[PDB]
Symmetry: D2
Subunit: 364 residues, 4 copies
């Protein structure tokens, strides 16, 4: 488990745009076989009927398939594609590409460095979404993802991304015909449950939350249960969970590091600023050391932000997750200097209620 990790933030002109990826390959800066994960932001609505996520995944897989002479569906088992829809406000569509190579024969740098590991769960039944099966399978996958990363302990774990399913009317009907009530019948709300259960799965595996408290009924209810590392993103494009564990390792030789923090609420730019500082980034022009930022945002479920009412949860035209991404994307852009950052919405059991975990990847 001794790798070298490269990370590349590449712009997208549209969800299907693979041209930035083709550039890296054709300029020799990354080898197709080494790519193990892509975390993207696509300009669909980030909710149920957002197919930019699947479209982006399909084009990326096709692009890599050509080079590796593989069928796209094979590439999707080889590579963890995690596409988060919704690029509201200043959020600029893009992919973060993660490549993994066997460690440059160390000659080991003086500290721990960026490592990454991936894992998948089985497909879930509709009636399992938001519930115990999803929690337990996710926990399992988080641990396998850690092992794959060569992450010695929780202390060295800085970010757990999970892609998870959602419910459609067909899946709901399919569950019903087996005499099983799905966790909800509202497709929008199903995303929260899927994200929530998955996040609790991470909290389970990281021992941030004791197993005893993780009953189905605690999901979306018990705000106190949370992982300060979990980033969950739901999608119509898959029936299983995809897990990416990102952390630091003695065995990694990457010229990159990662640190994590928590935003106390959607506008907590200070915490981001602080975590960035903890990686020795001073001026505005030292920001070019940051490869990307990854953050969770949500509408504060009490209906208030710093004592003032918000309308993000009462807005029947624009779902709360869209407002949340717009808000947090702006707060972060004001710090790093632009909106080409990964901000994912709906942060149930991820960081504090109304806030969310984030991580930063930077040059060593």
């Amino acid at each position: 488990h001794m790798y070298h990790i490269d990370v590349f933030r590449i712009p997208c002109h549209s969800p299907g745009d693979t041209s930035g990826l083709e550039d890296l390959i054709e300029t020799g800066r990354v080898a197709p076989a080494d790519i193990v994960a892509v975390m993207g932001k696509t300009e669909g609505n980030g909710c149920v009927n957002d197919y930019t996520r699947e479209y982006a995944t399909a084009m990326l897989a096709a692009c890599l398939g050509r080079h590796l002479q593989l069928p796209p569906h094979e590439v999707e088992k080889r590579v963890a594609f995690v596409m988060s829809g919704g690029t509201e406000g200043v959020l600029s569509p893009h992919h973060t590409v993660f490549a993994r190579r066997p460690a440059i024969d160390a000659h080991r740098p003086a500290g721990k460095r960026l490592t990454l590991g991936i894992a998948f769960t089985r497909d879930f039944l509709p009636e399992e979404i938001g519930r115990h099966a999803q929690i337990t399978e996710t926990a399992g996958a988080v641990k396998r993802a850690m092992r794959d990363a060569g992450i010695a302990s929780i202390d060295d774990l800085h970010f757990v991304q999970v892609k998870c399913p959602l419910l459609t009317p067909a899946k709901i009907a399919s569950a019903r015909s087996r005499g099983c009530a799905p966790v909800t019948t509202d497709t929008y709300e199903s995303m929260g449950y899927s994200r929530g259960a998955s996040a609790l799965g991470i909290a389970l595996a990281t021992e941030e939350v004791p197993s005893s408290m993780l009953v189905d009924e605690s999901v979306l209810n018990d705000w106190s249960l949370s992982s300060s590392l979990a980033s969950a993103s739901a999608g119509i494009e898959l029936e299983h969970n995809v897990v990416i564990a990102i952390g630091m390792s003695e065995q990694a030789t990457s010229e990159l590091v990662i640190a994590h923090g928590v935003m106390s609420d959607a506008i907590d730019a200070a915490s981001v600023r602080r975590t960035i500082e903890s990686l020795g980034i001073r001026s505005d022009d030292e920001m070019d050391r940051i490869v990307n930022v990854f953050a969770k945002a949500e509408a504060s479920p009490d209906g208030v932000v710093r004592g003032m009412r918000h309308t993000m949860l009462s807005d029947s035209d624009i779902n709360s997750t869209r407002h949340a991404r717009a808000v947090t994307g702006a707060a972060i852009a004001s710090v790093v200097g632009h909106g080409m950052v990964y901000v994912s919405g709906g942060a149930e059991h991820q960081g504090p209620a109304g806030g969310g975990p984030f991580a930063v990847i930077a040059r060593a």
Copy 2:
């Protein structure tokens, strides 16, 4: 209980437009003291953050207040204002004004005629919405509304309109602080529960559903439980239920009648045409005999309409109730020849699943 009922469909140029009502008053066609109910369609979104409903109610109440030298809030206890938001597609904003006078004699026509009665429940606690208290109180109010109407039996009952509350984040928090979980935490979904429990209240009172089956857990679950007379409309503008029972009575001398039916699904224009025909209306210009049509529409919860998939429940930009109103408004407009008709969306336990009750008011 011997009334004469007048019914006036009046156009609106905007939610606050009272100019059509001021016209009827100033042309002597209706007396302000006789107005007992207004059922409106306002051009807000018909969901949670739709304040066109409250705005329309406030201006109508102010208009009537001037003429009756009353405070608006007094008028709202005197008159049942039921404002249904959402006028999508060809739906044309308007009010239906119901006026009630002691029976005109003069002459009393042969056979039963249009009568109307109103009732109110108490304010509900947030945690009571969608649950037993709401069911039980509504049933009670339906009976009082029937008495007030002079409706001898269920057979003579043709339409029960109910206006009901919904949940906001504050109400949810209020409930939580009393250690009571609200029926849902999603404000959009709360409308369905409120409409559903209220509709089951109507079914209880009309003996369409036996009391034994009406447990909290059946609400939104058991599609088989329904009233073929119930029209439920949720709103942020009130904390209680408002009930309008419309039917036929020997004691009424109205030059108007009412018939009812069920649409099997959102495009079941045939059933509407059939019910219209059961009132002897057979050619396009004979449609002028119809004062208004009142109908419930919903997205079929199985995700299919006549075997083909629909996207109304997977659309995170446009809520299902908006699609449903647009669809059913069109289907009805194609029959009567325009969209100035009352179509309300979200028809849980109202008519068949995917369909909804409707009624027609016509010249005798």
Copy 3:
């Protein structure tokens, strides 16, 4: 120019779903090399940021590419993909696949039969959209599409579909930097101009409108100028026009025919019913003779439908084209019995103002 045309309506479970097409190929009912056009309805929003159109095109092209051992981009020059986004209300996502084979060595049936021809224009400059260049190039393409179809005269022409571009901020900036003002700076509105100019291109080529009247300034202004055959659909997925001319020919041996009509407004189900009748389709159960219906819908630009105000053009949450498709999709579904029909919105210079052309393809 002696072909046999097959037409297949196939369901889609999602924009990228090619499984119905793979079924036809693997059951031998269509040969990949014979497919000359696909007209689709995808469940994106049908406006600017709708990538379901491009996603569907990309998967279809990939699917056909495998079979023909071609690159997808080659297939897109071989086959006219026209994807219309927006499946609101009961509209059910699907593709209509058109295949063309050399005429079964006639043995010529007794009448004219369904023929189809395709053509493309060059890419347009941003500043050319909605303007004269787009008009004139389209006209040219319509004629080449007619010739390719073997359509002897206008009388035998029943449907001209055109796919056209739209403006984005980048295209607008690119135009500006050349010192050329684009026809509009609003991306939504640019779709209307693109559809409009393209429709006038069809009217030019069909001699429905004399060339003298087709100045730039008449586009979107002069409601009297229109083609009763034009169906225009704008999209972000292309910079040129794609044209499909569908009609009747002596040389075609297709077991299919086509007839066309005009809806006078969005709810004019009667005209559809009538045109269907003109193809000897009687009962509800003879509807299975209809392969598909293709129709244009729009929000009446005077703000009124049959004398009553509509809100489709004042709604800042839901664009008019979405309302229009929902409305007309319902009106047609009430006739044919389901919503799996092609309804495209925004019908500027297509049929009457507030109405739109439609066509019907049926078994001979």
Copy 4:
């Protein structure tokens, strides 16, 4: 012209909520006769079909009418109500109430203090919106508003709020029937033209732009023409312009001051922090000295923010002004510590292209 100005930021629970205003009156902190202006933020969509603006105005006017024993419509001639819809992200609905009393002496502080003056133009014809008449009339009103304020010169002018009309389909048709093309036929876009022409009116009156350049064709075209003081807000609720000039005067004895700046773009929190610092406010709890912040936000019309593409102008679900408000509301909230601030969207000829003027009112 010797006034004392009080300014009160008051929370709203809903658009019609007057309970905070009734509190100030009943606690003696403001006298109804002294109130000269209310600038509000209401939780409608801030675009065409937003009636929260008119609803809020109607309830405020009714509330004041009771106390002053006046009809609401009289109050609206006495008081400048400027309601800006759209409270996306962390934006918290509220009113800023401005009260004006004859100068309190007592004591008159050293140096210039907050003064305020109001003015109205005539109603515009539909065809005048976005054009020369609107520009010229606005300029006139700005000067009268300055006089009314006792603002000696441009140097002492810090904020010009203008409320302006927009186009509906009826107004468009009305214009058409007079043979006059309206500036646009798209209701959404009409807001930009109205805001733009009005803003150029302010620039004319303040001599920021020479009269020679202000031809109709420059409106929305020439990005170089702008006022660094103009804040324009369009609305369906009025046919004229309402102008509020806010500035500093020796004659004023207010315990309040005002400073202004420009955001270079939507995330330019630095400029806001800088302007706040120019009023000696340097730590987070010193923010309590700020009464409110007032700011213009817009989607950068080149489609980029700090070199990265944004999707705010390509998003057909959510209009650019909604994104813009969400973004700038967040950026400002991250500075002052909450979202109860006045942020209005669509900043054409207001500040730099992609940016907007703002002002700050603070305790002296």
